[PDB]
Symmetry: C2
Subunit: 227 residues, 2 copies
């Protein structure tokens, strides 16, 4: 009836800013960041237990460093606001922080570790995230645990299961995404929460992320309800 | 401009049959089967190199046995027609044929093995297929091979890679889908070609599968191209 877990991909930050004729396209990320905060607030008040925001892809790391640095700092403010003690939200990083750089990773880890584990609203921040690699790391995690418990090489070949992989993903012990909000008219996949979102409802809007409004969010929820 | 690989999901058969007034939902499946044959001709003539058709999922295998019996008969005739040597189409099967009964397994496998290996047009038929289940089996094929190369327990733990899984799936050595077409307005995912379609375009229509027309197929290529 209500999504137990909503996943949001924020497409169209640069495209949005170019439409309005902003020469300086990092501006789009600032507005997208403001919007993420408002989205989490909407989710939170709607009664949704888990929201997963897409903050950074291995794709995004192919951008020009003059703008990537701006984007990395923006992501870090966003996370430090999500983790603010006044929210009392439980926060988890989904992805590798080994790709974003030393000082920002530090700031991000510091912020997320200060949040409670028990809460009524949970947020996953997807940073340094790729879906096929999540799956690969879940398999190696699974196979190290089996080796630690004393499995032989013959017994490992058969240790892999669908439950074992779920348990060893970044989103271990969480519900799978019930609804996947995709924006800027994008009907492409990104391999975001690739394994977990195998059976999620897709919802699309034409609006670019910085232009996403509460009225669009209620449309999303109604459409989910009506399916 | 134009897809190399189009994957198709044929939902709505039963709903279509009940919409037309039939007491027997097998009219929908028989009509879906006609539509598959037509679809494949369209792809071929349009210039598409690989088509993937989703014939039977592991979900579907839980049906009433007498309805599944009759569905699998329809699927078998579908594949036998697809493999007609007039076509000179290359056919692979994608999924566990060990789930559908021995006589259908034999008939299907002998129709496909009779098709050429080198052809201008390739067709995948997905029978007894599941996305997460396909990943698990690719992993176990991977580890099985390297054990046979005399790898140690701890060597197996590290052997799993993205490129290693891409090699051991049912779609081994084939291009990933560019475009994925789903029907009955279902904006779910159902894990069809989960790994391979991580970065594919999705195209949706409200029309049940047995109502699919050449014009929708044209609308799908037009949307794909303009994206």
């Amino acid at each position: 009836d209500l999504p137990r877990h909503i996943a949001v991909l924020c497409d169209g930050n640069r495209r949005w800013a170019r439409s309005a004729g902003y020469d300086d396209v990092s501006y789009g990320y600032r507005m997208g960041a403001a919007k993420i905060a408002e989205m989490l607030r909407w989710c939170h008040e709607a009664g949704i237990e888990l929201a997963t925001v897409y903050l950074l892809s291995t794709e995004n790391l192919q951008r020009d460093p003059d703008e990537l640095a701006a984007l990395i700092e923006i992501i870090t403010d966003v996370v430090e606001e999500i983790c603010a003690p006044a929210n009392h939200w439980s926060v988890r990083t989904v992805g590798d922080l080994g790709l974003i750089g030393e000082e920002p990773a530090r700031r991000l880890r510091g912020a997320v570790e200060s949040t409670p584990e028990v809460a009524s609203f949970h947020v996953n921040v997807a940073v340094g995230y790729g879906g096929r690699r999540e799956i690969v790391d879940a398999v190696r995690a699974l196979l190290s645990k089996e080796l630690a418990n004393g499995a032989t090489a013959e017994e490992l070949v058969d240790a892999v299961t669908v439950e074992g992989i779920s348990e060893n993903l970044y989103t271990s012990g969480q519900p799978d995404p019930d609804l996947v909000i995709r924006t800027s008219g994008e009907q492409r996949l990104s391999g975001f929460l690739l394994w977990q979102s195998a059976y999620s409802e897709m919802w699309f809007t034409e609006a670019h992320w910085p232009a996403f409004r509460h009225v669009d969010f209620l449309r999303a929820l109604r459409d989910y309800s009506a399916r």
